[PDB]
Design a protein around this nucleic acid. Sequence first.
RNA 1: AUAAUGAAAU
RNA 2: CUUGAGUCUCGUAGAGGGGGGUAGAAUUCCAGGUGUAGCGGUGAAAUGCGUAGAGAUCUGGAGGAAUACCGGUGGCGAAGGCGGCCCCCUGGACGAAGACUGACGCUCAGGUGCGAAAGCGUGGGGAGCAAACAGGAUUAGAUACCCUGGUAGUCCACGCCGUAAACGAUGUCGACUUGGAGGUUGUGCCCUUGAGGCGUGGCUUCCGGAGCUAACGCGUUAAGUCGACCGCCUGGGGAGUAC
Lengths: 70, 88, 66, 106, 117
Amino acid sequence: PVIKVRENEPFDVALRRFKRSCEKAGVLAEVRRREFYEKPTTERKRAKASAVKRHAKKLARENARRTRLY
Amino acid sequence: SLSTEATAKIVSEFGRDANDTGSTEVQVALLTAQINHLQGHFAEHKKDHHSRRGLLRMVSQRRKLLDYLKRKDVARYTQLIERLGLRR
Amino acid sequence: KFCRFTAEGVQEIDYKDIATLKNYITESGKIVPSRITGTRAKYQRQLARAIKRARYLSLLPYTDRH
Amino acid sequence: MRHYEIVFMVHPDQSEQVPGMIERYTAAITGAEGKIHRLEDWGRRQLAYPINKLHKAHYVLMNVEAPQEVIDELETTFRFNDAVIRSMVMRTKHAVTEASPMVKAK
Amino acid sequence: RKQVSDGVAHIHASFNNTIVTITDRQGNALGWATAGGSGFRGSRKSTPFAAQVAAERCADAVKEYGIKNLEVMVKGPGPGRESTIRALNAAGFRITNITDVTPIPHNGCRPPKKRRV
RNA sequence: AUAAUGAAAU
RNA sequence: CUUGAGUCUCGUAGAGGGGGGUAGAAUUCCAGGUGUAGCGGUGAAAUGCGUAGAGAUCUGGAGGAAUACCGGUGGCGAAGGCGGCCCCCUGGACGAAGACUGACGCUCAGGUGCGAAAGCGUGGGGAGCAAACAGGAUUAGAUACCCUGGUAGUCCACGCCGUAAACGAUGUCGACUUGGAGGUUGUGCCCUUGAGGCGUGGCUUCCGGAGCUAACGCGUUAAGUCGACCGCCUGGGGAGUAC
């Protein structure tokens, strides 16, 4: 993220622009993920679990709109 | 694999006609050509285990075709193995 | 989803086409995902190869800080 | 004979030898019963990142058909020549003759 | 001394400390301050407030060069990324740029092992 | 942050 | 004899295998400039490094290990496994329309090959972090978990060893039996409205009917209904141990 301040621009606007740019780049997530070594077994297990959870949540939320609570 | 020109040349040499691509003689001759060619490759790359499965499959197929031909006609078998220089 | 390459019936993606390739990289120089753009998988693989060739020849950057 | 595409880059302070280089390489390729299908000289361009403390390199593009030994010798020539700073060689399925995107919007 | 009028502030923000260094445009230092030297130790050294005080002291320590315009480089994930920038703008410089220069490898060296506590 | 143990029967 | 099994002609997708080159980001070390009291680490600490000038910031050089983003319940391989870019050698799979041979097939005791990590031998190499080992700590104790260091090994060439919860805890081949929603990769036709419809093949993920099952569950990729060949079991310990 490189941010240049435009003429007449205040400082808070530039600060917010910088924060949004950093969030879009996603640097903090990378630095957090690269702090300790992870085993390939752990990595593959995490990926599979995330996919299964997303699928199950979708099925449940799509089937929960066919019943009346009261 | 073999090239179109070499394939056509072998088919002409060993078949009854340029359209006779399915005879035991043509099949055996093509397998022998490729087995002979690959000896140079495997003399330089001795740890290419994944490619050697195909070679072994070729060897087995040729053995089976020769056994069938020997059962069905001895004279053709003798002439073919003489022409190709095959025996241990 | 709309895929421009499928719409225009392209055969190869041409690492020399900087004008087109520029639409598919972020401002840091990273390759944009396919669920954001709509591209098909075949063309996504072709596109990644082309971007790598351009980076090597120096017609595109690797990062935004060299 | 197979089809190749070649790109090479030259030091900015030696732009006066590009025509002689093109002539020599064209002669080397055509002397072995080859053919030349596309040739372009893009001129000096700004680089995306520095190489050896340089910007502003000179680019040449070729599309040819030849045997393998000639291309091997050409690669050796690139390696040992000192005006050339980078090169790339790729194989193609068919011959290419159209004009490139670089000579249609520059 | 020698007037400069244009400088760069480097901010090193780790999980345990914050370091602020002010430099000319060619990399030559002029002054510095840290959170651990401003009267905070242990669990108080890794807060935004300590970083703010450190930036104030660094601004004070460079008043003989008469600096007017500053660029800002930030590096690290800790607390102290934004408090320092706010403190500088308040202390009265004019900020012209903001850049993130945190280093990231493209699959390089093996990191250390996980902590079981 | 750490942080042990409890005979056999009714 | 042509329906099983093979050969030939044109194309397509792929981290399939062996050899050789090369690029960019980052860590460590060496030699220089600016600058001056702290840095590093934890739940809290001190062992450690530092006024013989560290940590921070900028310029030049050396070395060897791995390839962010793309990247997905995505792809390839008999299994073990395989990921930057370029060239040389090489194995398998699939589709359309034809021609060709004529049962040339399936399974397999003994036999022969391939086979993750760690380990062994000879010769090289060595950023990073790491059994063993040494020192702060915590504790009633702490030959541990946590912190600061650190060598065998992890890398390369050739040769041994033959084991894993080597797992879908489900041997290989062939035929038959209601449905729904997706992913990836080929191909034919067009009312015509040139951006959309109607079909037909290969591989793969999830739900569920009849039947089956001790239950949990499986369900056209069967654990349903049948046929051909092989491997294995017979109460728990002693023991996958002794000779």
